UniProtKB/TrEMBL annotation, chain A:
Stated name of the protein: tRNA (guanine-N(1)-)-methyltransferase
Annotated binding of adenine, by residue: 128-129, 131, 133
NCBIfam families referenced in this protein's UniProt entry, alphabetically: PRK00026.1, trmD
Catalysis: reaction(s): guanosine(37) in tRNA + S-adenosyl-L-methionine = N(1)-methylguanosine(37) in tRNA + S-adenosyl-L-homocysteine + H(+)
Primary location group: cytoplasm
Length: 205, 215
């Protein structure tokens, strides 16, 4: 049984993932503006030390996490400056009772929010890849998907084929129709080797 | 002006593209994003898009016939066909910059155990095709990757190294935690330096690979 709370100023981004799950795991989405202070519902402010963009306010985020998090919570913060989120990470988090995902803008959440939370609960700042998003919402979607599909409920993969055996002048590799399953395995292994060399030589060292 | 077509068996799942950066870009007319139900190109009553794999293995493979018809209608020779897949070349910031100047992106979202390889092979005889991974984690399908790609690319469209260090804003003291004094000093040189040192610490600790170190 896993509970996921997402906090975001774009709550509608996450509805189409909440309404996708089967046997209700529970996924709840919260509008950050619930915890604003002022009639203007301000969530960000100018960065100390100058610079472009805006930093998300610690007083707002602090109130939101205070309400939603407990000592058992794993607080996940998608950020370009995060540790890499991997399948290993997904496996670890799949056994957790409570994930809270804090979605911020690219510019960031005041660092004191995470630092303060970390004195009471486990906090994980994570990046899903080396590209820049405008905010953490899309990364939250990726994390939610990768984690939840592992909830009870190396080399690259090579090419796959299905019917028909011949399509637009291209035949399915005859070995796959051979009924020689040791040979098929060996062929697939060689396809995986070639593809890993070509596309992901980093995986080979 | 850019056109993005997304083809998926879950068109409703691509509706998050309607807010945030992408939504604003669409509203401002800098991009048009159209989502297509793959099952529109089926002809049987059960609208079957998948079948069991040749050679054996777990799960199902998406049929080339349906994809071929869909891509025939949506793509031209100028199209950049994007296929998210765990076995793809890495999608990076460099890729996002490159695709940001494209006139037409078509994103094919796969489900089950993948799309028959001949779909990509056939398309490549007629247009540029890019199979890409957005990271080494396993998704159920290409839909979430499409959303990531769209966001990363659209924020670079005209009109729309080292890790970033910590950022701070008001108030200067919060829960007994103070903003680093150097940031309040207005000394642009000392601030630039502190920020450089923070990023170094963070990059070495979290992403040593960026600086050419192990793990
Ligand atoms: N660029 C970002 C901006 C804001 C929140 C997360 C990210 C992110 C996470 N992984 C890659 O990018
Ligand atoms: N795992 C997947 C399954 C289907 C379509 C894309 C992916 C993917 C791409 N990059 C990471 O995951």
């Amino acid at each position: 049984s896993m509970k996921i709370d997402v906090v975001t100023i774009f709550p509608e981004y996450l509805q189409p993932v909440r309404q996708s799950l089967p046997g209700k795991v529970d996924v709840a989405v919260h509008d950050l503006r619930r915890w604003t202070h002022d009639v203007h519902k301000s969530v960000d402010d100018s960065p100390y030390g100058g610079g472009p963009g805006m930093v998300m306010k610690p007083t707002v985020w602090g109130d939101a996490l205070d309400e939603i998090c407990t000592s058992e919570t794993l607080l996940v913060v998608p950020t370009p400056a995060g540790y890499p989120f991997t399948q290993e990470t997904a496996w670890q988090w799949s056994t957790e009772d409570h994930l809270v995902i804090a979605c911020g803008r690219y510019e960031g959440i005041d660092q004191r929010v995470a630092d303060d939370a970390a004195t009471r609960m486990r906090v994980r700042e994570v990046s899903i890849g080396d590209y820049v998003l405008n905010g953490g919402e899309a990364a939250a979607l990726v994390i939610i998907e990768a984690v939840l599909r592992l909830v009870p409920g190396s080399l690259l993969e090579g090419p796959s084929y299905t019917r028909p055996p011949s399509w637009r002048g291209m035949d399915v590799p005859p070995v796959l129709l051979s009924g020689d399953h040791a040979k098929i395995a060996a062929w697939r292994a060689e396809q995986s080797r070639q593809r890993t060399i070509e596309r992901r030589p980093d995986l080979l060292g």
